[PDB]
């Protein structure tokens with residue numbers, strides 16, 4: 001589809017069997033999701049933005065579906081105020097900026 | 100143009116007569132630039148990011164050129180880790196996401 005930027009580019013995603021709202025964020029190298037209890041191994045990581053850093057848990061090879069488009073890659077889980085779909089997954093679904 | 104997301108969507112911007120590199124950030128409501136001097140009046144404002152809230156100087160009706168497209172809108176100046184072009188200006192240049 002085509003998503004304008006009048007409002008936040010929020011879309012429905014499906015990760016680990018659950019549906020959520022997430023931000024298609026060209027400003028994020030990687031995907032960051034709100035706190036959730038995923039299974040599997042993980043490694044700790046610190047990620048930074050406006051306001052400082054937060055501690056996240058990095059999971060690898062996580063499948064999420066974005067508006068019917070399947071994508072699998074690295075997902076960071078921690079106390080983010082919003083679910084963020086980063087370029088690592090935006091590319092897999094064929095997402096581009098256009099102006 | 101059409102911009103793929105396998106690399107950071109960095110572009111050259113012109114502001115206050117100076118050129119700078121900025122990130123096209125669809126996950127940002129507002130445009131936030133690193134410390135710099137801009138002409139005109141400004142009011143103090145707060146903005147939140149992934150890591151918390153920071154103090155910024157709000158400049159209204161600033162002229163910015165992004166890849167040749169002119170925009171006139173609000174520019175926030177403060178301790179952001181990266182110069183980010185937010186949706187307030189991305190809409191002015193007719194930017195959209197597509198997939």
Ligand SMILES: CC(C)CN(C[C@@H](O)[C@H](Cc1ccccc1)NC(=O)O[C@H]1CO[C@H]2OCC[C@H]21)S(=O)(=O)c1ccc([C@H](C)O)cc1
Nearest residue numbers: 027028029030047048049050126127128129147148149181
């Ligand atoms: C700063 C840019 C360079 C990076 N960021 C993406 C940016 O899109 C954020 C996303 C966001 C964060 C909190 C609440 C809403 C949106 N937007 C933003 O800060 O916007 C500001 C300005 O306008 C206002 O609107 C919203 C909040 C305010 S990050 O989140 O910090 C991030 C860092 C590292 C990774 C991995 C490790 O690669 C992924 C994501």
